[PDB]
Amino acid sequence: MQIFVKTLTGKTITLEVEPSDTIENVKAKIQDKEGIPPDQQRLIFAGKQLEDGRTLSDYNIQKESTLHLVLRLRG
Amino acid sequence: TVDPNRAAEARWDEASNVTIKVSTKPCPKCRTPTERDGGCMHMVCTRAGCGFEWCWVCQTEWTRDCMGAHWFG
Ligand SMILES: [Zn+2]
Ligand SMILES: [Zn+2]
Questions:
Q1: I need a labelling partner for A37 at 20 to 30 A (CA). Which of A9, A73, B7, B25 fits?
Q2: Where is this site: Interacts with activating enzyme (chain A)?
Q3: How many domains is chain B partitioned into structurally?
Q4: CATH (domain of A41)
């Protein structure tokens, strides 16, 4: 399935993922094409945060769903 | 006397936009919330159409006065 990852920039990205994909693998797949580190990826899905140890099924994330990517700073 | 437009691609983006605006401070130059970890006051605006470095407390640019007076909290 295709999902949409909407960054705080306005650049929305396409990403192909399975319902069984772990949130860790979703962040690694964002790092591959965007260069963005997974430890700097705060994924938000309708107020709820995505924990790396969960899957897309654990949040009921289907195809065409739009995730929020918040970029964490180190200060 | 007119058929209303129908869509479902809403509410998830809205509730995410509301939650971020209350949990993170808006960038002074672009009104876009920017995440903050740890306790350094050195904030770098995560919007590419911005790059603006700002003091988390002072809401103004990053400067040596902010480095001596409150680099962290
Ligand atoms: Zn900004
Ligand atoms: Zn300051």
A1: B25
A2: 54, 72
A3: 1
A4: 3.10.20.90
